[PDB]
Specification:
viral protein, homotrimer, alpha helical triple coiled-coil, five-stranded antiparallel β-sheet, mainly beta, about 270 residues, beta sandwich, greek key, 2 domains, six-stranded antiparallel β-sheet, Outer capsid protein VP5* (chain B), flat, Single alpha-helices involved in coiled-coils or other helix-helix interfaces
């Protein structure tokens, strides 16, 4: 690293570091009720991953959040009957999709990172391939989605912040252009196959994390006095409405569920 | 204007004219049972980001419209499974306040973190409620309609907007309400003219309510305007809920699946 | 009171030394399981916000706290595998291996533009939180009641943190805590479990409006000298749209089915 200017209280520094970016994915999978043959959704969602890779004379504690943008809405409709398998909507990423990966590590450069300019960085290229996801039907066969794969290539880098129930981290966002790779995908036990992209079924595919190495450089505005600290940990209590709305539902449910647990019992008089 | 230039910093007073576009948001939860009972109609923070053409070029502003001190009304047309009901719905009056946080992509919000000497002149606008039909099993649907109030600037302060996508330090425009004429009512129901704005269809087809004005503040902002502040978010909060919900989704599905059988198998006569 | 340490043209490095009265509360999620209504699912702790107004020798103060808990112990009770046997699949209780985090913020001069701080430490009290009573009212039969429980907290450390509410975000101080299993035994009547100390998340508050602790601190906040500069403090949150939706959707399927029953009673 280098120094660029110094006024008593404050300082201007250019941090230049080489990093190892390990990130992961996340997906919400909602099954629909009734018989159990219909699936509601398979969307993507922010995916936090914090690791501790061995560097030089120090073990680098980094944190990432892997987000997705502009994903595509696919679907499968194997019939209008209670028995016809269906996936109302599942997200898949293609060339028109972008992958955002926010990176933050416990080092000196993020120390009091708040104001940055002259920011750029060289990056790798990596290929994330989909695994297997089986749709366990009650009585019958189990159609499994499999395949999917695309490579990501750095487009740009920017300032962002990662919010967890535990911490808030101003970090770097590494935009990504997606390239449809080979391993194409299909659903088994179904009349669909041959089509590219990465579906949100099992994007991680057993792998503990996808990795990308690279380096950057930025000029952050940090105090001359590097014996300071910025509040980093969180304590969140947001969306009380939902908490409530949900708990209220838990109620009506339980009620009805039990409205039965007393109708599915009153009749043990025979 | 440069009130003060310094080494690395710049005490600056930004004075801009802005067009504020905002929206409303409401949670509507119907109650279980026959489907005649409506549980609640509350307000909720409402995000809206527009791109307006300023007399120089275009700008990108974002807003979050919140409500405070709303009044809880209700309607109880009977204790029977067939008597229409609305356990609770929110309606704003003179005693209610509307908060509207504003942020735009311009130079002034660039590194906004510390501000003093903040004030501004603003317009006045009238939001009128639309129509919300209460769907029913039998009979023509009772429709809530009407409602209307004007907002007049009370003050302005420092706030931060929080979306799943972004966190924005911006300005909060407090509002005093003035109960305006269009009184609201519920078709096919004992509730005739009442003044205010119920959270049924606050927007009323309109894509956004608008207000123009200008402001004057002083933002302790560094100098080299090449600098910015982390603006985009990535939220993973309330893991407990996510879990609690999913868990419920389970017990539900379980029972759901467990009944429709003893129902599509009672269909054997 | 307050000492001005250093100072350039726009900033100023100050050391704030204040004495405070910390009043905080607890909070717990209690989920009963479905069915006959004999099975209890969970009793966890959760962040608890509490804001008060106490007079500091000279004036009227406005503080806000958030009481969080870490490393709690998972107990449970299984009095049978039948729809009629009482059960608490999982309830949290705190012991010596548990810590209590209490974030503190007040409307005073010292938190004004608090964002950068060093040379931070403080002396603090010691207080004892005791559990009250929580009854497991059953369809039929004497409601087994959980009662007792108690531990004392002693200051371990203090650090920087941010409190989050649907209303506000406040950079404030986190006061870590070491626990001591105090006198009060917690015990569930009508049942095998009895004679254990510790604090279970049933009724941690125990009617008390708040637990209190007094103390003072020392720090050095990097702030500007023109003290009319405010930091955005109020929130407006719209996070977790996914859940909102997921919930609502469930609300849907439920109502639907719920209706089919009441129509099964037509």
């Amino acid at each position: 690293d280098i120094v660029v200017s110094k006024t008593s209280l404050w300082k201007e520094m250019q941090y230049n570091r080489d990093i190892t970016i390990r990130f992961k994915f996340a997906s919400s999978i909602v099954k629909s009720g009734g018989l159990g043959y219909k699936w509601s959704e398979i969307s993507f969602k922010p995916a936090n991953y914090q690791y501790t890779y061995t560097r030089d004379g120090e073990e680098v504690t980094a944190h990432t959040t892997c987000s997705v943008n502009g994903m595509n809405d696919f679907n499968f409709n194997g019939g209008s009957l209670p028995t016809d398998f269906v996936i109302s909507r599942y997200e898949v990423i293609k060339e028109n999709s972008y992958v955002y990966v926010d990176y933050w590590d416990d080092s000196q450069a993020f120390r009091n990172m708040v104001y940055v300019r002259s920011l750029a960085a060289n990056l790798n290229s990596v290929i994330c391939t989909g695994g297997d996801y089986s749709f366990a039907l009650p009585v019958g066969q189990w159609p499994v989605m499999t395949g999917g794969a695309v490579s990501l290539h750095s487009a740009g880098v920017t300032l962002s912040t990662q919010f967890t129930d535990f911490v808030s981290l101003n970090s770097l966002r590494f935009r990504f252009r997606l390239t449809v790779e080979e391993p194409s995908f299909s659903i088994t036990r179904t009349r669909v196959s041959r089509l590219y992209g990465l579906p949100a079924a099992n994007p991680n595919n057993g792998k503990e994390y996808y990795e990308v190495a690279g380096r950057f450089s930025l000029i952050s505005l940090v105090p001359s006095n590097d014996d300071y600290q910025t509040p980093i940990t969180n304590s969140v209590t947001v969306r009380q409405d939902l908490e409530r709305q949900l708990g209220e539902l838990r109620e009506e449910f339980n009620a009805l569920s039990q409205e039965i647990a007393m109708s599915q019992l009153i009749d043990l008089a025979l």
